[PDB]
């Protein structure tokens, strides 16, 4: 019932349209840290602690 | 009962005929279109829309 049929006289028949879509995404921020003292390094048994 | 049996006298017996059929096909017309304006091209963000 929706086939674009055409007669020998043509005319303004079977017009169509188009569409488009948009996608999006965003970034975020992360981080963490730790703290220490000089003694916690110098007097510790393991010299490879850091 | 319908075998073409023939005797020694021959004669006009067991005549047959033939037939033929006609097939047909035809073509049809199709088409469609779309329209646009100059502003839909010049002011649109996407220079590759067309």
UniProtKB/Swiss-Prot annotation, chains A, B:
Cell compartment(s), UniProt: Virion
What is the role of the protein in this entry?
Assembles, to form an icosahedral capsid with a T=9 symmetry, about 60 nm in diameter, and consisting of 535 capsid proteins.
What is this protein called in UniProt?
Answer: Major capsid protein
Give the organism the record lists. Answer: Enterobacteria phage N4
């Amino acid at each position: 019932s929706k086939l674009p049929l055409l007669t020998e006289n043509g005319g303004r028949v079977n017009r169509v349209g188009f569409t488009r879509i948009a996608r999006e995404g965003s970034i975020h921020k992360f981080g963490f840290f730790y703290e220490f003292t000089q003694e916690s390094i110098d007097f510790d048994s393991d010299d490879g602690l850091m």
